[PDB]
Structure 1
Protein backbone atom coordinates (compact mmCIF):
# COMPACT_ATOMS: atom_id res chain seq x y z
CA UNK A 1 0.00 0.00 0.00
CA UNK A 2 2.54 2.61 1.18
CA UNK A 3 4.83 2.49 -1.90
CA UNK A 4 2.52 4.49 -4.19
CA UNK A 5 3.36 6.02 -7.55
CA UNK A 6 4.72 9.55 -7.69
CA UNK A 7 7.41 11.67 -9.33
CA UNK A 8 10.40 10.71 -7.18
CA UNK A 9 13.48 8.65 -8.00
CA UNK A 10 11.99 5.55 -6.40
CA UNK A 11 8.36 5.87 -7.57
CA UNK A 12 8.48 8.07 -10.67
CA UNK A 13 7.61 7.56 -14.34
CA UNK A 14 10.29 4.90 -14.96
CA UNK A 15 8.65 2.71 -12.30
CA UNK A 16 5.00 3.10 -13.25
CA UNK A 17 4.92 0.14 -15.67
CA UNK A 18 5.28 -2.33 -12.77
CA UNK A 19 1.83 -1.46 -11.39
CA UNK A 20 0.42 -0.15 -14.68
CA UNK A 21 1.80 -2.20 -17.59
CA UNK A 22 -0.16 -0.03 -20.07
CA UNK A 23 2.66 2.47 -19.39
CA UNK A 24 4.45 0.72 -22.28
CA UNK A 25 1.34 0.72 -24.47
CA UNK A 26 0.62 1.73 -28.02
CA UNK A 27 -0.91 5.17 -27.42
CA UNK A 28 0.78 6.67 -24.37
CA UNK A 29 1.04 10.38 -23.56
CA UNK A 30 2.63 12.84 -23.54
CA UNK A 31 4.62 12.94 -26.79
CA UNK A 32 7.00 15.25 -28.55
CA UNK A 33 5.21 17.27 -31.22
CA UNK A 34 7.48 17.44 -34.21
CA UNK A 35 6.12 20.51 -35.92
CA UNK A 36 7.56 19.94 -39.36
CA UNK A 37 6.10 16.40 -39.45
CA UNK A 38 2.61 17.06 -38.06
CA UNK A 39 0.27 17.31 -40.97
CA UNK A 40 -2.23 19.99 -41.61
CA UNK A 41 -5.66 18.40 -41.84
CA UNK A 42 -8.02 20.82 -43.62
CA UNK A 43 -10.99 18.63 -42.59
CA UNK A 44 -10.41 19.45 -38.88
CA UNK A 45 -12.94 21.89 -37.51
CA UNK A 46 -12.44 24.87 -35.28
CA UNK A 47 -12.58 23.97 -31.66
CA UNK A 48 -15.73 25.07 -29.88
CA UNK A 49 -14.91 26.00 -26.29
CA UNK A 50 -18.14 26.95 -24.47
CA UNK A 51 -17.22 27.89 -20.91
CA UNK A 52 -19.61 30.82 -20.23
CA UNK A 53 -21.86 28.71 -17.93
CA UNK A 54 -19.00 26.96 -16.08
CA UNK A 55 -19.58 26.26 -12.38
CA UNK A 56 -16.32 25.78 -10.54
CA UNK A 57 -16.77 24.27 -7.10
CA UNK A 58 -13.58 23.43 -5.31
CA UNK A 59 -9.80 23.24 -5.49
CA UNK A 60 -8.01 20.14 -4.18
CA UNK A 61 -4.36 19.24 -3.52
CA UNK A 62 -4.40 15.51 -4.36
CA UNK A 63 -0.73 14.91 -3.61
CA UNK A 64 0.34 15.04 -7.29
CA UNK A 65 -1.11 18.37 -8.47
CA UNK A 66 -4.03 20.61 -7.62
CA UNK A 67 -7.38 20.14 -9.36
CA UNK A 68 -9.94 22.90 -9.91
CA UNK A 69 -13.21 20.97 -10.05
CA UNK A 70 -16.42 21.77 -11.90
CA UNK A 71 -20.06 20.75 -11.77
CA UNK A 72 -20.29 18.22 -14.63
CA UNK A 73 -23.87 17.04 -13.91
CA UNK A 74 -25.17 19.15 -16.86
CA UNK A 75 -23.76 20.56 -20.14
CA UNK A 76 -22.43 23.76 -18.58
CA UNK A 77 -18.82 23.96 -19.70
CA UNK A 78 -18.27 21.91 -22.86
CA UNK A 79 -15.76 21.24 -25.58
CA UNK A 80 -17.00 20.30 -29.06
CA UNK A 81 -15.77 20.45 -32.63
CA UNK A 82 -12.16 20.09 -33.72
CA UNK A 83 -11.43 16.35 -33.95
CA UNK A 84 -14.29 15.48 -31.60
CA UNK A 85 -17.55 13.71 -32.29
CA UNK A 86 -20.16 14.78 -29.73
CA UNK A 87 -20.03 16.77 -26.52
CA UNK A 88 -17.36 16.67 -23.84
CA UNK A 89 -18.01 18.11 -20.37
CA UNK A 90 -15.34 19.88 -18.34
CA UNK A 91 -14.73 18.00 -15.07
CA UNK A 92 -11.49 19.58 -13.81
CA UNK A 93 -8.31 21.35 -14.71
CA UNK A 94 -4.83 21.04 -13.28
CA UNK A 95 -1.22 21.83 -14.19
CA UNK A 96 2.15 20.13 -14.47
CA UNK A 97 5.23 22.22 -13.73
CA UNK A 98 8.93 22.20 -13.10
CA UNK A 99 11.48 23.11 -10.46
CA UNK A 100 13.07 25.53 -13.00
CA UNK A 101 11.57 27.56 -15.84
CA UNK A 102 13.21 25.33 -18.51
CA UNK A 103 11.17 22.25 -17.65
CA UNK A 104 7.68 21.34 -16.52
CA UNK A 105 5.57 20.64 -19.58
CA UNK A 106 4.55 17.11 -20.51
CA UNK A 107 4.18 17.63 -24.23
CA UNK A 108 7.21 19.12 -25.95
CA UNK A 109 7.40 21.02 -29.24
CA UNK A 110 10.44 20.13 -31.35
CA UNK A 111 11.90 18.87 -28.05
CA UNK A 112 11.34 22.23 -26.35
CA UNK A 113 9.99 22.07 -22.81
CA UNK A 114 7.77 24.82 -21.44
CA UNK A 115 7.69 25.92 -17.79
CA UNK A 116 4.31 24.28 -17.23
CA UNK A 117 1.29 22.77 -18.95
CA UNK A 118 -2.41 23.27 -18.19
CA UNK A 119 -4.79 20.33 -18.74
CA UNK A 120 -8.53 20.98 -19.02
CA UNK A 121 -10.07 17.51 -18.70
CA UNK A 122 -13.39 16.73 -20.40
CA UNK A 123 -15.45 13.54 -20.75
CA UNK A 124 -17.71 12.33 -23.53
CA UNK A 125 -21.32 12.68 -22.39
CA UNK A 126 -22.38 9.59 -24.43
CA UNK A 127 -20.77 7.46 -21.69
CA UNK A 128 -22.81 9.04 -18.88
CA UNK A 129 -20.11 9.42 -16.23
CA UNK A 130 -16.37 10.00 -16.04
CA UNK A 131 -15.63 6.53 -14.68
CA UNK A 132 -17.33 4.92 -17.67
CA UNK A 133 -15.69 7.37 -20.09
CA UNK A 134 -12.12 6.47 -19.07
CA UNK A 135 -12.81 2.89 -20.17
CA UNK A 136 -13.44 4.02 -23.78
CA UNK A 137 -10.96 4.91 -26.56
CA UNK A 138 -12.84 8.17 -27.18
CA UNK A 139 -13.89 8.78 -23.60
CA UNK A 140 -11.93 11.94 -22.77
CA UNK A 141 -10.72 15.09 -24.47
CA UNK A 142 -7.90 16.95 -22.74
CA UNK A 143 -7.16 20.48 -23.86
CA UNK A 144 -3.48 21.18 -23.19
CA UNK A 145 -2.08 24.69 -22.97
CA UNK A 146 1.59 25.53 -22.54
CA UNK A 147 2.81 28.11 -20.02
CA UNK A 148 5.90 30.25 -20.52
CA UNK A 149 7.32 32.69 -17.99
CA UNK A 150 7.00 36.37 -18.86
CA UNK A 151 4.09 38.70 -18.15
CA UNK A 152 1.52 37.69 -15.55
CA UNK A 153 -1.70 35.95 -16.57
CA UNK A 154 -4.36 37.98 -14.79
CA UNK A 155 -6.95 35.18 -15.03
CA UNK A 156 -4.61 32.83 -13.16
CA UNK A 157 -4.14 35.01 -10.08
CA UNK A 158 -7.28 33.79 -8.25
CA UNK A 159 -5.84 30.26 -8.49
CA UNK A 160 -2.40 31.39 -7.29
CA UNK A 161 -3.83 33.21 -4.31
CA UNK A 162 -5.74 30.20 -2.93
CA UNK A 163 -2.73 27.85 -3.02
CA UNK A 164 -1.60 28.82 0.51
CA UNK A 165 -4.83 27.25 1.79
CA UNK A 166 -4.26 23.86 0.09
CA UNK A 167 -0.54 23.54 0.70
CA UNK A 168 -0.56 19.85 1.55
CA UNK A 169 -1.99 16.62 0.19
CA UNK A 170 -5.69 16.15 0.93
CA UNK A 171 -6.47 19.81 1.59
CA UNK A 172 -9.32 21.41 -0.36
CA UNK A 173 -10.98 24.81 -0.45
CA UNK A 174 -14.18 26.26 -1.86
CA UNK A 175 -13.43 27.68 -5.30
CA UNK A 176 -16.63 28.96 -6.81
CA UNK A 177 -17.15 31.43 -9.65
CA UNK A 178 -13.80 30.86 -11.31
CA UNK A 179 -13.93 31.49 -15.05
CA UNK A 180 -11.58 29.20 -17.00
CA UNK A 181 -11.94 31.44 -20.09
CA UNK A 182 -9.28 33.59 -18.43
CA UNK A 183 -6.69 30.81 -18.89
CA UNK A 184 -6.98 30.58 -22.69
CA UNK A 185 -4.61 32.11 -25.25
CA UNK A 186 -5.93 34.23 -28.15
CA UNK A 187 -5.64 31.53 -30.81
CA UNK A 188 -7.32 28.14 -30.74
CA UNK A 189 -4.96 26.65 -33.36
CA UNK A 190 -4.06 23.15 -32.21
CA UNK A 191 -2.39 19.82 -32.70
CA UNK A 192 -4.31 16.62 -32.02
CA UNK A 193 -3.51 12.94 -31.59
CA UNK A 194 -4.89 9.86 -29.77
CA UNK A 195 -3.24 9.19 -26.42
CA UNK A 196 -3.62 8.47 -22.76
CA UNK A 197 -3.86 9.84 -19.28
CA UNK A 198 -0.37 11.01 -18.28
CA UNK A 199 -0.72 9.74 -14.70
CA UNK A 200 -1.60 6.28 -13.45
CA UNK A 201 -3.77 4.50 -14.39
CA UNK A 202 -2.45 5.72 -17.80
CA UNK A 203 -5.64 4.66 -19.57
CA UNK A 204 -5.67 5.00 -23.35
CA UNK A 205 -8.87 7.01 -23.48
CA UNK A 206 -7.82 10.53 -24.47
CA UNK A 207 -8.14 12.64 -27.59
CA UNK A 208 -5.39 15.19 -26.98
CA UNK A 209 -5.89 18.74 -28.24
CA UNK A 210 -2.74 20.81 -27.62
CA UNK A 211 -2.90 24.51 -28.36
CA UNK A 212 -0.09 26.03 -30.43
CA UNK A 213 -0.04 29.35 -28.59
CA UNK A 214 1.29 29.34 -25.03
CA UNK A 215 -0.03 31.58 -22.30
CA UNK A 216 2.40 33.76 -20.36
CA UNK A 217 2.52 33.65 -16.56
CA UNK A 218 4.81 35.61 -14.29
CA UNK A 219 7.78 34.27 -12.39
CA UNK A 220 5.91 35.07 -9.16
CA UNK A 221 2.90 33.03 -10.29
CA UNK A 222 4.90 29.89 -11.06
CA UNK A 223 6.98 30.33 -7.90
CA UNK A 224 3.72 29.99 -5.97
CA UNK A 225 2.98 26.67 -7.72
CA UNK A 226 6.41 25.52 -6.51
CA UNK A 227 5.55 26.24 -2.83
CA UNK A 228 2.90 23.52 -2.80
CA UNK A 229 3.71 20.21 -1.10
CA UNK A 230 3.41 16.60 -2.29
CA UNK A 231 3.31 15.57 1.41
CA UNK A 232 0.40 15.70 3.83
CA UNK A 233 0.22 18.09 6.78
CA UNK A 234 2.62 17.16 9.57
CA UNK A 235 4.94 15.22 7.26
CA UNK A 236 8.43 16.19 6.04
CA UNK A 237 8.24 18.84 3.33
CA UNK A 238 8.56 17.65 -0.27
CA UNK A 239 8.01 20.56 -2.64
CA UNK A 240 5.47 19.85 -5.38
CA UNK A 241 7.74 20.38 -8.41
CA UNK A 242 8.55 18.32 -11.52
CA UNK A 243 5.19 16.59 -11.54
CA UNK A 244 5.47 15.87 -15.28
CA UNK A 245 5.80 12.64 -17.24
CA UNK A 246 8.37 12.82 -20.04
CA UNK A 247 7.55 12.27 -23.71
CA UNK A 248 6.65 8.70 -24.68
CA UNK A 249 7.19 6.88 -27.99
CA UNK A 250 4.85 8.03 -30.76
CA UNK A 251 4.59 4.50 -32.20
CA UNK A 252 1.87 4.11 -34.84
CA UNK A 253 0.39 7.61 -34.56
CA UNK A 254 0.12 10.76 -36.57
CA UNK A 255 -0.17 14.19 -35.06
CA UNK A 256 -2.55 16.43 -37.02
CA UNK A 257 -2.47 20.24 -37.15
CA UNK A 258 -5.55 22.44 -37.43
CA UNK A 259 -3.47 25.17 -39.07
CA UNK A 260 -1.05 25.67 -41.94
Structure 2
Protein backbone atom coordinates (compact mmCIF):
# COMPACT_ATOMS: atom_id res chain seq x y z
CA UNK A 1 0.00 0.00 0.00
CA UNK A 2 2.27 2.75 -1.38
CA UNK A 3 1.42 6.41 -1.63
CA UNK A 4 -0.03 7.72 -4.82
CA UNK A 5 -2.81 9.90 -6.25
CA UNK A 6 -5.81 7.52 -5.96
CA UNK A 7 -8.78 7.60 -3.60
CA UNK A 8 -7.22 5.26 -1.06
CA UNK A 9 -3.59 6.40 -1.29
CA UNK A 10 -3.70 10.03 -2.47
CA UNK A 11 -2.93 13.35 -0.82
CA UNK A 12 -5.60 13.10 1.92
CA UNK A 13 -3.91 9.90 3.17
CA UNK A 14 -0.24 10.94 3.05
CA UNK A 15 -0.18 12.39 6.59
CA UNK A 16 -0.48 8.93 8.16
CA UNK A 17 2.97 7.85 6.94
CA UNK A 18 4.33 11.40 6.62
CA UNK A 19 2.93 13.53 9.44
CA UNK A 20 4.79 16.59 8.11
CA UNK A 21 2.00 16.67 5.51
CA UNK A 22 0.17 18.85 8.08
CA UNK A 23 3.29 20.93 8.82
CA UNK A 24 3.96 24.63 8.88
CA UNK A 25 5.57 25.09 5.45
CA UNK A 26 3.94 22.65 3.06
CA UNK A 27 3.70 23.00 -0.70
CA UNK A 28 2.12 23.76 -3.06
CA UNK A 29 0.12 26.86 -2.14
CA UNK A 30 -2.27 29.22 -3.82
CA UNK A 31 -0.48 32.41 -4.88
CA UNK A 32 -2.81 35.27 -4.06
CA UNK A 33 -1.33 37.88 -6.40
CA UNK A 34 -3.21 40.63 -4.38
CA UNK A 35 -1.44 39.72 -1.21
CA UNK A 36 2.02 38.94 -2.61
CA UNK A 37 4.35 41.91 -2.06
CA UNK A 38 7.21 43.16 -4.21
CA UNK A 39 10.50 42.58 -2.34
CA UNK A 40 13.25 45.01 -3.28
CA UNK A 41 15.75 42.88 -1.24
CA UNK A 42 15.57 40.14 -3.89
CA UNK A 43 18.71 40.05 -6.03
CA UNK A 44 18.53 39.35 -9.79
CA UNK A 45 17.74 35.68 -10.53
CA UNK A 46 20.37 33.78 -12.53
CA UNK A 47 19.38 30.63 -14.40
CA UNK A 48 22.67 29.36 -15.85
CA UNK A 49 21.93 26.21 -17.85
CA UNK A 50 24.32 26.40 -20.78
CA UNK A 51 26.60 23.55 -19.58
CA UNK A 52 23.81 21.24 -18.46
CA UNK A 53 24.46 17.58 -19.00
CA UNK A 54 21.34 15.50 -19.06
CA UNK A 55 21.85 11.77 -18.65
CA UNK A 56 18.67 9.80 -18.42
CA UNK A 57 14.86 9.86 -18.24
CA UNK A 58 13.07 7.69 -15.69
CA UNK A 59 9.40 6.77 -15.01
CA UNK A 60 9.37 6.49 -11.18
CA UNK A 61 5.68 5.56 -10.90
CA UNK A 62 4.58 9.08 -9.88
CA UNK A 63 6.04 11.25 -12.72
CA UNK A 64 9.03 11.07 -15.10
CA UNK A 65 12.36 12.65 -14.20
CA UNK A 66 14.98 13.99 -16.64
CA UNK A 67 18.18 13.58 -14.61
CA UNK A 68 21.36 15.58 -14.87
CA UNK A 69 24.99 15.06 -14.03
CA UNK A 70 25.39 17.17 -10.91
CA UNK A 71 28.96 16.02 -10.07
CA UNK A 72 30.28 19.46 -10.94
CA UNK A 73 29.03 23.01 -11.14
CA UNK A 74 27.30 22.94 -14.60
CA UNK A 75 23.63 23.97 -14.59
CA UNK A 76 22.98 26.19 -11.63
CA UNK A 77 20.45 28.55 -10.14
CA UNK A 78 21.52 31.50 -8.03
CA UNK A 79 20.35 34.95 -7.07
CA UNK A 80 16.79 35.92 -6.30
CA UNK A 81 16.03 34.82 -2.76
CA UNK A 82 18.91 32.37 -2.80
CA UNK A 83 22.16 32.53 -0.90
CA UNK A 84 24.90 30.66 -2.80
CA UNK A 85 24.72 28.19 -5.63
CA UNK A 86 22.10 25.53 -6.31
CA UNK A 87 22.83 22.76 -8.81
CA UNK A 88 20.24 21.24 -11.11
CA UNK A 89 19.70 17.52 -10.44
CA UNK A 90 16.43 16.71 -12.24
CA UNK A 91 13.25 18.11 -13.71
CA UNK A 92 9.78 16.62 -13.88
CA UNK A 93 6.15 17.67 -14.39
CA UNK A 94 2.78 17.34 -12.77
CA UNK A 95 -0.28 17.32 -15.05
CA UNK A 96 -4.00 16.71 -15.29
CA UNK A 97 -6.50 14.38 -16.97
CA UNK A 98 -8.03 17.52 -18.52
CA UNK A 99 -6.58 20.85 -19.62
CA UNK A 100 -8.30 22.74 -16.78
CA UNK A 101 -6.27 21.08 -13.99
CA UNK A 102 -2.81 19.66 -13.39
CA UNK A 103 -0.73 22.36 -11.75
CA UNK A 104 0.25 22.15 -8.07
CA UNK A 105 0.59 25.85 -7.40
CA UNK A 106 -2.40 27.96 -8.35
CA UNK A 107 -2.55 31.69 -9.15
CA UNK A 108 -5.61 33.39 -7.66
CA UNK A 109 -7.07 29.85 -7.51
CA UNK A 110 -6.43 29.29 -11.26
CA UNK A 111 -5.14 25.80 -12.11
CA UNK A 112 -2.89 25.40 -15.14
CA UNK A 113 -2.77 22.27 -17.32
CA UNK A 114 0.62 21.25 -15.91
CA UNK A 115 3.61 22.47 -13.91
CA UNK A 116 7.33 21.92 -14.56
CA UNK A 117 9.66 21.55 -11.56
CA UNK A 118 13.41 22.11 -12.04
CA UNK A 119 14.94 20.74 -8.85
CA UNK A 120 18.22 22.10 -7.45
CA UNK A 121 20.31 21.45 -4.32
CA UNK A 122 22.44 23.87 -2.32
CA UNK A 123 26.07 23.08 -2.96
CA UNK A 124 27.12 24.12 0.55
CA UNK A 125 25.71 20.74 1.73
CA UNK A 126 27.83 18.62 -0.61
CA UNK A 127 25.18 16.09 -1.80
CA UNK A 128 21.41 16.06 -2.43
CA UNK A 129 20.91 13.66 0.48
CA UNK A 130 22.49 16.05 2.96
CA UNK A 131 20.68 18.97 1.39
CA UNK A 132 17.29 17.43 2.22
CA UNK A 133 18.21 17.58 5.90
CA UNK A 134 18.42 21.42 5.74
CA UNK A 135 15.81 24.20 5.78
CA UNK A 136 17.55 25.84 2.77
CA UNK A 137 18.68 22.65 1.08
CA UNK A 138 16.71 22.83 -2.15
CA UNK A 139 15.40 25.34 -4.66
CA UNK A 140 12.67 24.36 -7.09
CA UNK A 141 11.96 26.54 -10.10
CA UNK A 142 8.30 26.06 -11.03
CA UNK A 143 6.91 26.90 -14.45
CA UNK A 144 3.27 26.68 -15.42
CA UNK A 145 2.10 25.07 -18.67
CA UNK A 146 -0.97 26.15 -20.58
CA UNK A 147 -2.32 24.45 -23.71
CA UNK A 148 -2.01 26.38 -26.93
CA UNK A 149 0.97 26.54 -29.31
CA UNK A 150 3.55 23.75 -29.09
CA UNK A 151 6.78 24.18 -27.14
CA UNK A 152 9.41 23.02 -29.63
CA UNK A 153 11.98 22.49 -26.85
CA UNK A 154 9.68 19.98 -25.15
CA UNK A 155 9.28 17.68 -28.16
CA UNK A 156 12.40 15.61 -27.51
CA UNK A 157 10.94 14.76 -24.10
CA UNK A 158 7.53 13.90 -25.57
CA UNK A 159 9.04 11.62 -28.14
CA UNK A 160 10.96 9.44 -25.65
CA UNK A 161 7.95 8.80 -23.43
CA UNK A 162 6.90 5.74 -25.40
CA UNK A 163 10.14 4.06 -24.20
CA UNK A 164 9.39 4.68 -20.51
CA UNK A 165 5.69 3.94 -20.43
CA UNK A 166 5.68 2.08 -17.15
CA UNK A 167 7.04 2.42 -13.65
CA UNK A 168 10.75 1.59 -13.33
CA UNK A 169 11.58 2.06 -17.02
CA UNK A 170 14.48 4.40 -17.91
CA UNK A 171 16.18 5.45 -21.12
CA UNK A 172 19.29 7.36 -22.07
CA UNK A 173 18.55 11.02 -22.50
CA UNK A 174 21.71 12.89 -23.19
CA UNK A 175 22.21 16.37 -24.65
CA UNK A 176 18.77 17.73 -23.71
CA UNK A 177 18.89 21.49 -23.17
CA UNK A 178 16.50 22.70 -20.43
CA UNK A 179 16.88 26.30 -21.66
CA UNK A 180 14.26 25.36 -24.28
CA UNK A 181 11.60 24.98 -21.56
CA UNK A 182 11.89 28.51 -20.14
CA UNK A 183 9.49 31.42 -20.82
CA UNK A 184 10.81 34.83 -21.86
CA UNK A 185 10.35 36.49 -18.49
CA UNK A 186 11.96 35.46 -15.20
CA UNK A 187 9.47 37.48 -13.07
CA UNK A 188 8.57 35.20 -10.15
CA UNK A 189 6.98 34.65 -6.79
CA UNK A 190 8.94 33.04 -3.95
CA UNK A 191 8.15 31.47 -0.60
CA UNK A 192 9.55 28.82 1.73
CA UNK A 193 7.94 25.37 1.35
CA UNK A 194 8.35 21.68 0.91
CA UNK A 195 8.56 18.78 -1.48
CA UNK A 196 5.10 18.24 -2.92
CA UNK A 197 5.40 14.44 -2.80
CA UNK A 198 6.23 12.16 0.12
CA UNK A 199 8.42 12.53 2.09
CA UNK A 200 7.13 16.15 1.96
CA UNK A 201 10.37 17.46 3.45
CA UNK A 202 10.40 21.19 4.34
CA UNK A 203 13.64 22.04 2.58
CA UNK A 204 12.55 24.05 -0.45
CA UNK A 205 12.84 27.65 -1.51
CA UNK A 206 10.12 27.80 -4.18
CA UNK A 207 10.60 30.16 -7.15
CA UNK A 208 7.43 30.11 -9.33
CA UNK A 209 7.61 31.99 -12.63
CA UNK A 210 4.68 34.21 -13.48
CA UNK A 211 4.74 33.65 -17.22
CA UNK A 212 3.55 30.19 -18.28
CA UNK A 213 4.92 28.32 -21.27
CA UNK A 214 2.51 27.07 -23.92
CA UNK A 215 2.52 23.44 -24.95
CA UNK A 216 0.22 21.85 -27.53
CA UNK A 217 -2.73 19.64 -26.86
CA UNK A 218 -0.85 16.84 -28.58
CA UNK A 219 2.19 17.27 -26.28
CA UNK A 220 0.15 17.04 -23.05
CA UNK A 221 -1.90 14.17 -24.50
CA UNK A 222 1.33 12.20 -24.72
CA UNK A 223 2.04 12.86 -21.06
CA UNK A 224 -1.34 11.36 -20.32
CA UNK A 225 -0.45 8.06 -22.04
CA UNK A 226 2.18 7.24 -19.43
CA UNK A 227 1.36 4.68 -16.76
CA UNK A 228 1.63 4.76 -13.00
CA UNK A 229 1.80 0.95 -12.95
CA UNK A 230 4.67 -1.28 -13.87
CA UNK A 231 4.92 -3.46 -16.97
CA UNK A 232 2.41 -6.34 -16.92
CA UNK A 233 0.32 -4.75 -14.21
CA UNK A 234 -3.21 -3.31 -14.73
CA UNK A 235 -3.04 -0.08 -16.67
CA UNK A 236 -3.53 3.10 -14.62
CA UNK A 237 -2.91 6.20 -16.72
CA UNK A 238 -0.45 8.66 -15.20
CA UNK A 239 -2.75 11.64 -14.90
CA UNK A 240 -3.71 13.99 -12.05
CA UNK A 241 -0.33 13.49 -10.33
CA UNK A 242 -0.67 16.83 -8.48
CA UNK A 243 -1.05 17.74 -4.84
CA UNK A 244 -3.67 20.43 -4.18
CA UNK A 245 -2.84 23.72 -2.48
CA UNK A 246 -1.97 23.55 1.23
CA UNK A 247 -2.47 26.09 4.00
CA UNK A 248 -0.18 29.10 3.78
CA UNK A 249 0.10 29.34 7.60
CA UNK A 250 2.69 31.92 8.70
CA UNK A 251 4.19 32.62 5.32
CA UNK A 252 4.46 35.54 2.99
CA UNK A 253 4.78 35.19 -0.77
CA UNK A 254 7.19 37.76 -2.24
CA UNK A 255 7.17 39.05 -5.80
CA UNK A 256 10.27 39.88 -7.84
CA UNK A 257 8.33 42.46 -9.90
CA UNK A 258 6.55 45.72 -9.10
* Residue 174 (structure 1) shift: 0.1
List per-residue Cα deviations over 1:48-79 (Å, max 9, x = no partner): 00000000000000000000000000000000
Residue number in structure 2 paired with 1:169: 167
Distance 2:35 2:25 in 1: 18
8 Å contact from structure 1 (residues 46, 188) kept in 2: no
List per-residue Cα deviations over 1:209-249 (Å, max 9, x = no partner): 00000000000000000000000000110000000000000
Distance 2:64 2:167 in 1: 9
TM-score by length of 2: 1.00
Q: Please list every run of 5 or more consecutive structure 1 residues that lacks an aligned counterpart in the other structure.
A: none
* Residue 146 (structure 1) shift: 0.1
Residue number in structure 2 paired with 1:47: 45
Runs of 4 or more, structure 1, over 6 Å off, are none
* Residue 46 (structure 1) shift: 1.7
Three-state SS of the structure 2 residue aligned to 1:73 is coil
* Residue 154 (structure 1) shift: 0.2
Distance 1:74 1:188 in 2: 25
List per-residue Cα deviations over 1:169-199 (Å, max 9, x = no partner): 0000000000000000000000000000000
Three-state SS of the structure 2 residue aligned to 1:158 is helix
* Residue 43 (structure 1) shift: 1.6
Distance 2:232 2:34 in 1: 49
8 Å contact from structure 1 (residues 168, 230) kept in 2: yes
Three-state SS of the structure 2 residue aligned to 1:242 is coil
Distance 2:111 2:160 in 1: 27
Distance 1:259 1:36 in 2: 13
Distance 1:151 1:134 in 2: 37
Distance 1:40 1:47 in 2: 14
* Residue 45 (structure 1) shift: 1.5
